[PDB]
């Protein structure tokens, strides 16, 4: 849907952008490398059209940086340059570009190569989601959340920016499987997953870390702010009326351990895990159905 | 690794083929639509180079058939044609083609667009493997085995070919977790996984279907032959000396339900599941540590 066009020439850039917007895409113009970096950071991009010679650098150098910013990890990049030498073609593709059009770009071909780029991007995005999300709940699975804590932790140390973590665990869940069966247990987990998915800010990262265990990172959020939010959700879950398959009404609760905030005195990300884990056991021994931070 | 090249012209085809094999790919040549059909059916292909005007029809008609032989339903297809009309470009891409070179093809561009196609394919295939594999055992998970039974069922019906299925479940495994802990339980599961991985042929498809449950497809194997194989594995498992965390020796066994063979009477793949499931319950009620078929 959203396409970023990096070209120094006014005439060429306004032309390309008219063509692309005309077929129902959103066009994002960038007159320079400097303005391109600004647009990548600030807007989710599906395809890039990339000039080679910009007034403030070379497209090749920007390819690397685009792929490492991409929140999904791969993005189709199509070169649109005056450079016609086959050596320049091989270099761009090897640098990470997907396609390469020599100027002047022709409208029919351009829109068809964008079609082909977005088709592959759509398949990639689906394959990615099935690899990193848990099948039953559609939350992030463990093997991916581990990598994302690491990469999210480092990111917030190499910046003066807060990062709170919650670890939650369903109260007396083995008792629920024994009373109402595995199949009702599965439904309770699915219901909690759906409440977590819809209750937090869009930046919050939610994982199904174990059978009945969940971990949530809150970027740019203090420990106190994360705790009030998670305590509203815990209140909401406690007042849900669940039905068994024999029309028995029942409630469930979860316990929470919160950690992080100011990360100054926390050295590795695994120290963040253990503070949250210690707090969750605090919550379990302190009467359950509560958050501790 | 394997590239299919469909071109009517011997000079062009042997040239393209030399270029591709030169960069460490295997080249499969096809002089005509007729010979291409026979190569697609008989060899798994990573990329196709596709001429449009063949003596016995049009490449575009072949695109659809190529995409449906991919087990996930998508393959990089690069048009390499004399056709320079924008309508031929738009229709090839819309038909399913990924890329399009106008003749005369240059070696550098050709191999760089192949690189681009195979780079995407390699990332997709890795994302796929992480989505279909269970982390603990490294076997196929449930969501994938369900789809693969369907795929293998239909494919064994569209041939006069046998297909046996086993369903197994560990005997008194809750007792093993309760006596020796969750972590010894995890090792017992892993031990069974290792026995399955090393006991069956190359052709066997092995899945972790539940916590402690496994299903195995045996292509071109009778029910009687699948039963002795799974019974030799059951004998091997029963004679393993397992250690607790306090150097206590113990044995574990599984019960087996086998199904399928001649597929003539069998209507859907779900019927295969239930016959195996029924047999496994028979095996559990009959004294456990045994196979029933
Ligand atoms: N239905 C269902 N049950 C599960 C699943 N995964 C684990 N369980 C069950 O939930 C149990 C959770 O164990 P615990 O951490 O001991 O929690 P608990 O026994 O409920 O008690 P508490 O959390 O309050 O300590 C373990 C397992 O028996 C699942 O995917 N589905
Ligand atoms: N350690 C471990 N235990 C698991 C895992 N997944 C499930 N379990 C446990 O295994 C239990 C198996 O129970 P059942 O399938 O009823 O079989 P069983 O109790 O072994 O008895 P039987 O098949 O002989 O009737 C369910 C759960 O307690 C796992 O991943 N690891
Ligand atoms: Mg320029
Ligand atoms: Mg619990
Ligand atoms: Mg737990
Ligand atoms: Mg069992
Ligand atoms: Mg079982």
Q: Could you state the oligomeric state of the chains shown?
A: homodimer
Helix proportion of chain A:
40-55%
Task: Report the CATH topology name of the largest domain in chain A.
Answer: Alpha-Beta Plaits
- From the spread of the alpha carbons, the general shape of chain A counts as elongated
EC number (chains A, B): 2.7.7.65
Keywords (chains A, B): Metal-binding, Nucleotide-binding, Phosphoprotein, Plasmid
Protein name (chains A, B): diguanylate cyclase
Catalytic activity (chains A, B): 2 GTP = 3',3'-c-di-GMP + 2 diphosphate
Topology overview:
Two copies of one chain form a homodimer.
Chain A: E1 2-6, H1 10-22, E2 26-30, H2 33-42, E3 47-50, E4 53-54, E5 57-58, H3 59-69, E6 77-81, H4 86-95, E7 99-102, H5 107-132, H6 142-157, E8 163-170, H7 173-180, H8 182-199, E9 205-208, E10 213-219, H9 223-239, E11 242-243, E12 249-250, E13 254-261, H10 269-285, E14 291-292
Protein architecture, described:
The structure is a homodimer of 293-residue chains. With 293 residues, chain A is of the alpha/beta class. Chain A folds into two domains: 2-132, Rossmann fold, CATH 3.40.50.2300; 142-292, Alpha-Beta Plaits, CATH 3.30.70.270. Chain A has ten helices and 14 strands. Chain A has helices at residues 10-22, 33-42, 59-69, 86-95, 107-132, 142-157, 173-180, 182-199, 223-239, 269-285, and strands at residues 2-6, 26-30, 47-50, 53-54, 57-58, 77-81, 99-102, 163-170, 205-208, 213-219, 242-243, 249-250, 254-261, 291-292. A five-stranded parallel beta sheet of chain A has the order 2-1-3-6-7, with helices on both faces. A five-stranded mixed beta sheet of chain A has the order 9-10-8-13-14, sandwiched between helices. Chain A has a two-stranded antiparallel ribbon with strand order 4-5. In chain A, helix 7 (173-180) packs across helix 8 (182-199). The first copy, chain A, is elongated, with a radius of gyration of 24 Å. At the A-B interface, helix 4 and helix 5 of A face helix 4 and helix 5 of B. The structure holds 3'-deoxy-guanosine-5'-triphosphate (2 copies) and magnesium ion (MG) (5 copies).
């Amino acid at each position: 849907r959203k396409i970023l066009i990096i070209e120094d020439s006014e005439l060429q850039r306004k032309l390309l952008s008219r063509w692309v917007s005309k077929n129902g895409y959103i066009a994002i113009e960038a007159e320079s490398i400097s303005v391109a970096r600004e647009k990548i950071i600030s807007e989710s991009i599906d395809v890039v059209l990339l000039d080679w010679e910009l007034p403030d650098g070379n497209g090749i150098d920007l390819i690397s940086d685009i792929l490492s910013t991409s929140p999904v990890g791969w993005l189709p990049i199509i070169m649109v340059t005056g450079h016609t030498e086959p050596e320049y073609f091989k270099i761009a593709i090897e640098a990470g570009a997907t396609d390469y059009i020599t100027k002047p770009a022709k409208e029919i071909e351009l829109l068809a190569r964008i079609f082909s780029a977005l088709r592959i991007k759509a398949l990639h995005d689906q394959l990615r989601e099935t690899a990193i999300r848990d099948v039953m709940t559609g939350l992030y699975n463990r093997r991916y959340m581990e990598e994302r804590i690491e990469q999210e932790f480092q990111r917030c140390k190499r910046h003066d920016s807060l990062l709170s973590m919650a670890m939650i665990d369903i109260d007396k869940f083995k008792n629920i499987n024994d009373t109402y069966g595995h199949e009702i247990g599965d439904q309770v987990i699915k219901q909690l997953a759906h409440e977590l998915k819809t209750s937090f800010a869009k930046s919050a990262i939610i994982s199904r870390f174990g059978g009945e265990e969940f971990v949530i990172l809150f970027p740019e959020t203090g420990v106190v702010d994360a705790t009030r939010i998670l305590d509203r959700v815990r209140e909401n879950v406690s007042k849900l009326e669940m039905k068994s398959d024999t029309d028995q009404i029942f409630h469930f609760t979860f316990s929470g351990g919160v950690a992080g905030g100011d990360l100054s005195d926390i050295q590795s990300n695994q120290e963040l895990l253990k503070i949250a884990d210690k707090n969750l056991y605090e919550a379990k021994s302190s009467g359950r159905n509560q958050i501790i931070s």
